[PDB]
Amino acid sequence: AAKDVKFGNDARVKMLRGVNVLADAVKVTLGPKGRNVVLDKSFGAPTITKDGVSVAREIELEDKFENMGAQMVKEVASKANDAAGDGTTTATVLAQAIITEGLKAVAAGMNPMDLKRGIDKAVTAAVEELKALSVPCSDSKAIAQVGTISANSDETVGKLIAEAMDKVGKEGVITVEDGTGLQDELDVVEGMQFDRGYLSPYFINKPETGAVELESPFILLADKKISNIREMLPVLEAVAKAGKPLLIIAEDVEGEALATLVVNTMRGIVKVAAVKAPGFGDRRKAMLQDIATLTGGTVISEEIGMELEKATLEDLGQAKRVVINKDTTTIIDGVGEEAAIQGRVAQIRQQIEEATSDYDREKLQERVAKLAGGVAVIKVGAATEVEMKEKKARVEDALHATRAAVEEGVVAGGGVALIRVASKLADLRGQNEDQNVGIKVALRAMEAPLRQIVLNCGEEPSVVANTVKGGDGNYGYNAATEEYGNMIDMGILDPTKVTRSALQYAASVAGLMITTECMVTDLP
Amino acid sequence: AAKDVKFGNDARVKMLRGVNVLADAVKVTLGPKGRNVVLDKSFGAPTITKDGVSVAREIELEDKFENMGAQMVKEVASKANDAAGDGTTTATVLAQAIITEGLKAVAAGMNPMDLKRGIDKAVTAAVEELKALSVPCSDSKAIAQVGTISANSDETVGKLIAEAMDKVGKEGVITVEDGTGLQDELDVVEGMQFDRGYLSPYFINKPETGAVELESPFILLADKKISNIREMLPVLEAVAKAGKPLLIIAEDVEGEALATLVVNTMRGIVKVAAVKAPGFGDRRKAMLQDIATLTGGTVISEEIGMELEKATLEDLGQAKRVVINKDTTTIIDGVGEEAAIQGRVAQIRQQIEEATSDYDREKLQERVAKLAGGVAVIKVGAATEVEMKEKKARVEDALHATRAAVEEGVVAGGGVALIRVASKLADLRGQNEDQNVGIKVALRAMEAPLRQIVLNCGEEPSVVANTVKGGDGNYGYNAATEEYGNMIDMGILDPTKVTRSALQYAASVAGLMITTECMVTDLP
Amino acid sequence: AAKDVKFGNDARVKMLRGVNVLADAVKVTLGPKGRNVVLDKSFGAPTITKDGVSVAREIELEDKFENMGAQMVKEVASKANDAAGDGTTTATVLAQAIITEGLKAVAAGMNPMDLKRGIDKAVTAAVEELKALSVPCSDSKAIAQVGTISANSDETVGKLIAEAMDKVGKEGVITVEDGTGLQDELDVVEGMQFDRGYLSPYFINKPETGAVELESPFILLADKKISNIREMLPVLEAVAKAGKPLLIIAEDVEGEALATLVVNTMRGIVKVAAVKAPGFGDRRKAMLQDIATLTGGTVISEEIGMELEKATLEDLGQAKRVVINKDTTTIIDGVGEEAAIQGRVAQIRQQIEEATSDYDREKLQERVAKLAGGVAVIKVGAATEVEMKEKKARVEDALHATRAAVEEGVVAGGGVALIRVASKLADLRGQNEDQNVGIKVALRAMEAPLRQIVLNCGEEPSVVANTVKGGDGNYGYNAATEEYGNMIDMGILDPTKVTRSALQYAASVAGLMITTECMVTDLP
Amino acid sequence: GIKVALRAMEAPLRQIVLNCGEEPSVVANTVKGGDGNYGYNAATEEYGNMIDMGILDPTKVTRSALQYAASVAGLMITTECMVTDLP
Ligand SMILES: Nc1ncnc2c1ncn2[C@@H]1O[C@H](COP(=O)(O)OP(=O)(O)O)[C@@H](O)[C@H]1O
Ligand SMILES: Nc1ncnc2c1ncn2[C@@H]1O[C@H](COP(=O)(O)OP(=O)(O)O)[C@@H](O)[C@H]1O
Ligand SMILES: Nc1ncnc2c1ncn2[C@@H]1O[C@H](COP(=O)(O)OP(=O)(O)O)[C@@H](O)[C@H]1O
Ligand SMILES: [Mg+2]
Ligand SMILES: [Mg+2]
Ligand SMILES: [Mg+2]
């Protein structure tokens, strides 16, 4: 509406303070010695977390100019989380050091626009160095180590995650849920399973819980619900002839079908139970072909060349057995050929490489794992609900970190990789002196993540940093153990992607931010 | 809306004060000499309670940082109540001692994360120690003592509760209601009974108040309302031929069926009364099978290939007698075999262990006890509603305490068990000194519940503790009689579960709380 | 309701200050060394921009009289942006110099109406000089230079845009969208394409992702949607007789027509499917004739003398092949005479030349590019969301700058064109002295854009101005390299249209503003 | 109390370095690494034997300063109450 305007240094100073407030809050949660930050909620209970992205979202400042600086730095932490789900706190630290030094350079009389370019080119060069340093992380011990390091140095977290990734496979789906006990527990689901139970409670086969176990059953898929649509007798009768159980997947099954069905099942004529498809028409219809092909069956195209009666017994899918409860249906193993299993998976590859990425990929891969791999769920122990969210959150960070480490490798932790690369880029130069200073400023900022970790440990950041620089390769300081050695051998590893993303996201916002001459905001 | 941020010691001090305010409110109500807390309600007259959880829920501080501290400690008291329904005041005290000592350790210059690990390791060991100490409470005398101790040393409450648990059984359901008199009274329900009156007021078998007693009745169950679908008479007529009374359970019965029924019943041709099912769709339908199986009858499943007319006299269940009134229907005993009763109970086991837990188990166990055991209701006598709430509240706490004592045994009271276990753990060490101090801090905090009890009695908390520590096993100080002796022999018992839960819940929040470096809250 | 009135100098001073506030905020972003402006909003994330128009739109002042001045100057920046999309910051600067000097003239005892006439006369003469100075930009290198200069001396932007304009042609359409990747990308579309996908997913000719390729298809256009209006069989059969694929464009196609169509396409009867028309009746109907004429087909005018069945195979248009996916339909090349492609284009000239220009031209030219030229889409890379809009914003400025440069030619950059033309007009005299001063003032103001650029550089604007005036023709100062030379040789180019528009738009509003004797506004 | 007194000792060295515009934490760490009279001379920005270089304090002044500092400190540590004239 109405504006308050500041020029040059006055605008940058206020912006810097906003950045410092946001960043200082974020910094205390960086490292094994990192300490928790509590966010005030008026909803039910306060939240205490060591996750940098969560803290950044929450922070808004009373001073409009300072707030604007903080709001812009908020995004780098936000973007880092979006990319790999970890290193958000580290990214914020880099933004803090780049911005502070860059503004200082601007004060010196240098053109910030040139400074951005220096920084941006330095960043591009730094990224290439990170890729060189990055080494594959395919073994279980290394995966555990990244999980352990990511989840505030918890060895158990990394170990459990490593087992999960190993058992489910490369494309498997891993999730984390609240645990009943104080103990961390891993659950693995083998085969094809979904969240819909049986409409006919009455047909219970052996176990209670409403469990339905059909042995060598035929699977029926349809695009229409069945009411008085019981007319499918030659199809069901054919099944009746073989004396085999029938499993039905469709939009819905009505009381008429179930009433007659229950008696047929109860007298032993046919053991048949029906369960509703996954949900939305786009959702269930897409998911039907895979169940059909997996079981060797044929999907009934209601809207096309098929009808309720029209379909021979061979069109039905076959499975060893199924498990049905009120809320869930499990197929033990449908009998289908590998060419069909892979073919269903192969058509999925286009689906995998999708521009949408959010929503489409998450659900779609779940089908993929289920079709040929497996799905794993991790339970987290903790006496209280608040302890539980912190513990679970860190575990998720480790889960994301392992995913990042596998796909793009790992680099030495403790901030050593950024400080080590900075020495390498010492010879980088640009078009003019202002750019050269910008390049140098970016390198200078690289050091900061290392020293924050040490600072949070209540130890002199400068002492540790000087000895670390003096060292070679992966040599660095272990904050937790309070001693010096090879970071990789100690099991402290940062996934390369989070490290890279942190530096690129920090620099990207920082470069433009340092170039701000004029700030525009509302008056009180 | 901007946020207020505090760092380190300033945040921890404010947090501590919030904790102290909440804890001080709770502490005064701890022990035989515990004092009352009055909660102001604009609803009606103010409430007076000695229950710590009730007091904890109410407390919220003007200062946002202090409030945040209190809200976090509020949860330990709240969680304890949810778990066992007692020891909430004791749990809060442990949080008070743990946090005060822990923050002080942080002040010294130690990693809070390490202190928390020390505390957690000590807690895990403490819990295990409690299980060893826990002496089984399988007799009525011990149960009475735990009830009496829970009820702020009210002997009548404890004895009454023991009789209730004894009479109903292990899976029996015990509830407490406000009495219409000044005297405490126990009510026990035998056989199968439900909260539904009779549709036809007109037919009363003999006793007044709508009391219907059918002698050797046949019981009919249905999934249908009856209006102009009276055609079922061949079934009714068959019963008329028999000369036996008919009991009817269905979704509803209307005047056409009721009006014909009334005259047939009025002049003695048939003695038949109809009552509506338990309540909600699958809740009532779920409960129909047990009624019919218990009585040896068959449920007419509309939903299953059966019909209203289709049912023989033999299908109907048989009972010695039933009792009905305007709001209640009771069956003295159905003729059903034990293997079928157990089969119904066995199938209930899945129902027993379920994710829903809250409310589902409460209603589900009601069916369970009703099916083979008994249901007990306790009335509390008080002239005034305010006196009644305090008296009744303590009774419920005692009821929960007995349930906890039966399930997990008991430990010596007066906080002696926690202080006694602490001596055992004096030999517990972690990876480093910071953890060792955390361990030591937890052990130190164990003593506090004992001393708070003594403190409330106007006696030196430290001296009593020193003499109690010098004792063996269950030796301790009895606050009520002001002298030392064997706590178990004096009838002071703490259910193991409440003691265990108190320590675990208190420590879990306390550990996280001491690790707080930054607190964020809204501006004043 | 009530009004505040100010007279003479006080009114002008408040107006001037309002102008100065707006202009000072805008000036900071002018030049290679220009600096960013950050805008705060309650909707999403704060904006960082170097675009003067974006900054101008936001600014509104607390003082009603100052606001009135700022609002009037806001329009010159806005109008310039709307006219050419670039030079908005420079235009604002001219308004600043014109008004400052003009007001000074007002304070000199001069008639403002005459001063305005002098300004207007000087501007008319200046424009003609600009017309003479402009040299056509026809080579790729020069276009790249204008794009690069507009994009704040970013070489990649100029390179990418130069390739695009050359490839799409003069009437082709170039747009910019946010890119998925970090790097900038260019997409070029050949032939005729539209944004509506296929109704039948089942219909995939060969490649996956819903990709359909029909070889030598017959194209059908209709003004109706097919539900149960299935009959068109003799039309369909004729295509079947031919053995060629059929493409259908209409308001809609239903499942009944699609279901039979799917079966028809699978076995081998016909390879045929339909895609929905562009959108609104006038947009789709107006766009139907061109697709039919392009392919040599006839649009079925349900409205006119044509109906469903009434139309043989020859009526249908032809194309070499089409590309169909979920979101788009592409015609590779329709077979039609150029006597008709041009005819569709020729009627378009009235369509191209009209008052609406916004909405109408974008969509209409889009058709034009598709009909005879090419369409290019540019994707913008950036690590972060804030970087992405700044990068993208500048790219649009370059896109518009290149469009302006090709249409009207280019002039030397750095503001040298205006300073050089001012010397030329040094002998222009009006009716009287007051006008002569007004003229002289406009010439004086021309110099300012050059010096503002130098001022942001951290160098003395006056020293550069004196040296540049002393020089000849295109001689000027390069802010980026800090040295003098030939601006054209350097590659610093100003499209004539942005330069001309800036000067005329600034002057038009400025002349009126200096004329003010009294200002009326609401009370504070 | 012991730790408080031992690290309190560091303050004058660090103060010297701080005044000079040098990092006290860095200088002190290296000086600790050395032995005897070895240390950093703020005036010349060099490390070695401070006494040989030309920087030293009498033992009596160093001792007296340290003991007086501790003596006054202990009195403040033990001071429960203060009494003064109104503002
Ligand atoms: N025990 C440790 N010793 C040395 N460095 C560590 C240790 N644990 C973690 N780090 C490092 O410090 C970084 C930040 O820790 P973290 O809180 O997880 O931040 P993110 O939240 O990961 O920025 C890690 O990415 C890693 O390089
Ligand atoms: N007469 C007593 N003598 C010694 N200890 C007692 C006596 N009565 C109760 N206690 C103890 O003090 C604790 C707290 O009493 P209570 O008010 O019931 O708190 P909860 O509400 O149980 O925290 C008991 O759990 C028990 O161990
Ligand atoms: N590197 C440069 N050296 C000299 N002059 C430049 C340079 N870059 C841009 N200019 C000039 O200064 C003007 C303003 O730059 P710009 O920020 O793009 O403003 P607009 O936003 O174009 O007013 C340009 O139109 C051009 O004439
Ligand atoms: Mg991490
Ligand atoms: Mg109690
Ligand atoms: Mg521009």
CB distance B293 to B336 below 8 Å: yes
Return d(Cα B445, Cα A516) in angstroms, integer: 55
Question: Residue D26: its chain A contacts at CB < 8 A?
Answer: 460, 462-463, 466
Domain C193-366 homologous superfamily, CATH = GroEL (3.50.7.10)
CA D59/CA B404 separation, integer angstroms:
72
The answer on whether B89 is annotated among ligand-binding residues is yes
Query: In Å, what is the CA distance from C92 to each residue of A182, B264, B516?
Result: 67, 101, 53
| Cβ count within 10 A of residue B461 | 17
Cα pseudo-dihedral B40, B42, B43, B49, rounded to 10: 0
**How open is the CA angle C69-C72-C78, to the nearest 5 degrees?**
135
Under DSSP, the state recorded for C109 is T
Distances from the Cα of C319 to the Cαs of B46, C145, C220, C296, in angstroms? 87, 40, 11, 9
Test A518 with C37 for CB contact under 8 angstroms: yes
- DSSP-H helix ranges across B134-176: 140-150, 155-168
Q: Which helix (H) or strand (E) covers residue C172, if one does?
A: none
Token duo for residue B355? 């994710």
Task: Give the amino acid at C190.
Answer: E
The phi, psi pair for A78, rounded to 5°, reads: -60, -45
Question: CA angle, C99 as apex, C94 and C105 as ends, to 5°?
Answer: 130
Burial B181-214 (b: 16+ CB within 10 A, else e): eeebeeeebebbbbebebbbeebbbeeeebbbbb
Note whether B197 and B324 are within 8 A (CB).
yes
- Chain centroid, CA C433 distance in Å: 41
How far apart, in whole angstroms, are the C-alpha atoms of residue C34 and residue C89? 10
Judged by CB atoms closer than 8 Å, whether chains meet at A36 and B64 is answered as no
Spell out the residues 6+ positions from residue A126 whose beta carbon is closer than 8 angstroms to its own. Answer: A418, A421, A422, A425, A442, A443, A446, A503
CA C361, distance to chain mean position in Å, is: 11
User: In terms of C-beta density within 10 A (0-12 exposed, 13-18 middle, 19 or more buried), how is residue A468 classed?
Assistant: buried
Q: Are B117 and B438 in contact (CB under 8 A)?
A: yes
Amino acid identity for residue A158 in this structure:
G
CA geometry: angle at C310 spanning C305 and C316, to 5°? Answer: 100
- Chain A to chain B Cβ contacts (< 8 Å): 121
Q: How many CB atoms within 10 Å of residue C242?
A: 14
Q: Closest by alpha carbon to A129, among A418, A429, A402?
A: A418
Residues 6+ apart with CB under 8 A from B44: none
**H or E stretch at B387:** helix B385-408
Contact by Cβ (8 Å): C231, C205: no
Using alpha carbons, select from C188, C189, C177 the residue that is nearest to residue C381: C177
If residue A500 lies in a helix (H) or strand (E), which one and from where to where?
Answer: helix A496-514
Please name the residue ranges forming H helices in A295-379.
338-352, 360-372
Distance from C-alpha of A241 to C-alpha of B424, rounded to nearest angstrom? 72
Q: Residue B379's CB: how many other CB atoms inside 10 A? A: 18
Portions of chain C given CATH number 3.50.7.10: 193-366
Q: Which of A9, A79, A518 to mutate to test the interface with C (most CBs of C within 10 A)?
A: A518
Asked if residue A465 lies in contact with residue A450, where contact means CB atoms within 8 angstroms, the answer is yes
Residue nearest to ligand 2 atom 27, measured at CA: B413
Q: How would you class A362 by CB atoms within 10 Å of its CB: exposed for 0-12, middle for 13-18, buried for 19 or more? A: exposed
* CATH 1.10.560.10 segments of chain A: 1-134+410-524
Crossing angle of helices B416-424/B433-446, nearest 10°?
150
Q: Which of A495, A502, A440, A452 has the alpha carbon at shortest distance from A477?
A: A452
Structure tokens at C67: 């606001």
Residue B500 to residue B312: CA distance in whole angstroms? 57
Structure tokens at D58: 């009498």
**Reduced to 3 states, what is the DSSP secondary structure of residue A478?**
strand
- Rg over alpha carbons for chain B, rounded to the nearest Å, is 29
Cα of C487 from ligand 6 centre, angstroms: 17
CB A224 within 8 A of CB A302: yes
- Cα–Cα distance, B22 to B19 (Å, whole number): 5
DSSP-derived secondary structure for C274-301 = EEE-SSSHHHHHHHHHHHHHHHT--EE-
From chain C, the residues in CB contact with A68 under 8 A are 38, 40, 46
The span from the CA of C37 to the CA of C336, in Å, is 53
Rounded to the nearest 5 percent, the helix, strand and coil shares of chain C are: 50, 15, 30
Q: Å resolution of this model? A: 9.2
In this structure, the dihedral spanned by the alpha carbons of residues C95, C97, C99 and C104, taken in order and rounded to 10 degrees, is 180
Q: Would you say C403 and C497 are in contact if contact means Cβ atoms under 8 Å apart? A: no
Q: Is A153 in the pocket of ligand 1 (CB under 6 A)?
A: yes
Rounded Cα gap, residues C315 and C333, in angstroms:
17
Rounded distance, CA A464 to CA A83, Å? 30
Pairing of strands B252-253, B225-226: parallel
Among residues C285, C147, C139, C271, the alpha carbon closest in space to that of C200 is found at C271
Which chain A residues touch B509 with a CB distance below 8 Å? 384, 386-387
**Options 3.30.260.10, 3.30.930.10, 2.40.33.10, 1.10.287.70; which CATH number does B135-192+367-409 get?**
3.30.260.10
State how far the Cα of A60 lies from the Cα of B111, in Å rounded to an integer. Answer: 29
C-alpha to C-alpha distance for B128 and B428, rounded to whole angstroms? 13
Please provide the DSSP assignment of B180-207 as one string: SSSS-EEEEEESEEES--BS-TT---SS
CA dist A334 and A463 (Å) reads 63
The number of C-alpha atoms within 13 Å of B272 and in the hemisphere containing its C-beta is 28
Supply the residue whose CA is at minimum distance from atom 15 of ligand 3. C31
Closest CA to B6 of A39, A152, A41: A39
Distance (Å, whole) CA A60 – CA B4: 10
Comparing CA positions, the residue from C212, C157, C166 lying closest to residue C376 is C166
List all residues 6 or more positions away from B237 whose beta carbon is below 8 Å from its beta carbon. Answer: none
Q: Do B509 and A386 touch (CB under 8 A)?
A: yes
Q: Which residue of A has its CA nearest to D27?
A: A463
- Asked whether the CA dihedral C192, C198, C200, C202 is positive or negative, the reply is positive
H or E stretch at B67: helix B64-83
Amino acid at A226: I
Contact B122, B442 (CB under 8 A): yes
Q: Does an interface of 3+ CB pairs under 8 Å exist between C and A?
A: yes
The CA radius of gyration of chain A, in Å to the nearest whole number, is: 29
**Rounded distance between C-alpha atoms, residue A111 and residue C457, angstroms:** 7
CA C474 to chain centre: 28
Distance CA C368, CA D65 (A): 92
CB half-sphere exposure, C384, CA atoms < 13 A:
33
The token duo for C289 is 């004739």
Place of tokens 């400052």: C100
Regarding the beta carbon of B197 and ligand 2, being less than 6 Å apart is answered: no
**A225 membership: H or E segment, kind and range:** none
Dihedral pair phi/psi, residue B403, rounded to 5°: -60, -40
* Alpha-carbon gap, residue A247 to A217, rounded angstroms: 7
Which among D3, D18, D23 is the top mutation candidate for probing chain A, defined by the most A β-carbons within 10 Å of its own β-carbon?
Answer: D23
User: CA separation (Å) from D66 to C103, C140, D8, D69, D72?
Assistant: 73, 80, 10, 5, 10
Rounded to 5 degrees, φ, ψ at A146 are: -70, -40
Please report, to the nearest 10 degrees, the dihedral formed by the alpha carbons of residues C101, C106, C109, C113 taken in order.
120
SS3 D19: helix
CB atoms within 10 A of CB A323: 18
User: Which residues have C-beta within 8 Å of that of residue B396, sequence separation ≥ 6?
Assistant: B85, B176
Of all protein residues, the one whose alpha carbon is nearest to atom 12 of ligand 2 is: B31
- Tell me the C-alpha to C-alpha distance, in Å, between residue B255 and each of B224, B228, B266, B275: 15, 9, 15, 13
**Whole-angstrom distance, CA of residue D37 vs CA of residue D49:** 5
A277/A250 Cα distance (integer angstroms): 5
Angle in degrees, 0-180, between the axes of helices B64-83 and B9-27, rounded to the nearest 10 = 50
DSSP H/E element including A378: strand A374-380
- A450 and A416 in contact (C-beta within 8 Å)? yes
d(CA C519, CA C12): 8
Give the number of other CB atoms < 10 A from CB of residue A310: 12
Residues of A in contact with C44 (CB under 8 A): none
Give the distance (Å) from ligand 5 centre to CA of residue B163: 19
- DSSP label at residue C253: B
Rounded-to-integer distance, Cα B113 and Cα B102, Å: 11
**C30 annotated to bind ligand:** yes
Distance, CA of C482 to CA of C493 (rounded, Å): 16
- Whether the Cβ atoms of residue C391 and residue C382 lie closer than 8 Å to each other: yes
- Using DSSP, state whether A304 is helix, strand or coil: coil
Distance of CA B381 to the CA centre of its chain: 20
What is the dihedral angle through the alpha carbons of B382, B383, B387, B389, rounded to the nearest 10 degrees? 60
Which positions ≥6 away from A300 have C-beta within 8 Å? A220, A221, A222, A223, A306, A311, A315
Kindly list the residues of chain A whose beta carbon comes within 8 Å of any beta carbon in chain D. 460, 462-463, 466
Residues C517 and C8: beta-carbon distance below 8 Å: yes
Rounded CA separation A42/B346 (Å): 45
Rounded distance, CA D77 to CA D75, Å?
Answer: 5
Tokens of B422: 């602490």
Q: What DSSP state is assigned to residue B231? A: T
Find the angle CA(C389)-CA(C391)-CA(C392) to the nearest 5 degrees: 60
How would you classify the pairing of strands C36-39 and C317-318?
Answer: unpaired
In this structure, the strands spanning A218-221 and A246-250 are parallel
Q: Give CA–CA dist C154/C147, Å, rounded.
A: 8
Element (H, E) at D56: none
Method: cryo-EM
How far is B67 from B351, CA to CA, in rounded Å? 40
Q: Is C255 annotated as a binding residue?
A: no
The CATH fold assigned to C1-134+410-524 is GROEL; domain 1 (1.10.560)
Q: Tell me how far apart the alpha carbons of residues C58 and C64 are, in angstroms, rounded to a whole number.
A: 16
Other beta carbons within 10 Å of B430: 19
CB-based contact C112:C514 (threshold 8 Å):
yes
CATH code 3.30.260.10 region(s) in chain A: 135-192+367-409
CB atoms within 10 A of CB C240: 16
Residues from chain D contacting residue A463 (CB–CB below 8 Å):
25-26, 29
CA distances from B455 to B29, B415, B459, B461, C341 (A): 11, 13, 5, 5, 100
Q: Tokens 């390490």 map to which residue?
A: B114
Q: Report chain A's terminal Cα–Cα distance, integer Å.
A: 11
Distances (CA, A) of C207 to A309, A350, C190, C273: 34, 10, 19, 16
Q: Following DSSP, what letter does each residue of C178-242 receive, concatenated?
A: E-SSSS-EEEEE-SEEES--BS-TT---SSSSS-EEEES-EEEEESS-BSS----HHHHHHHHHH
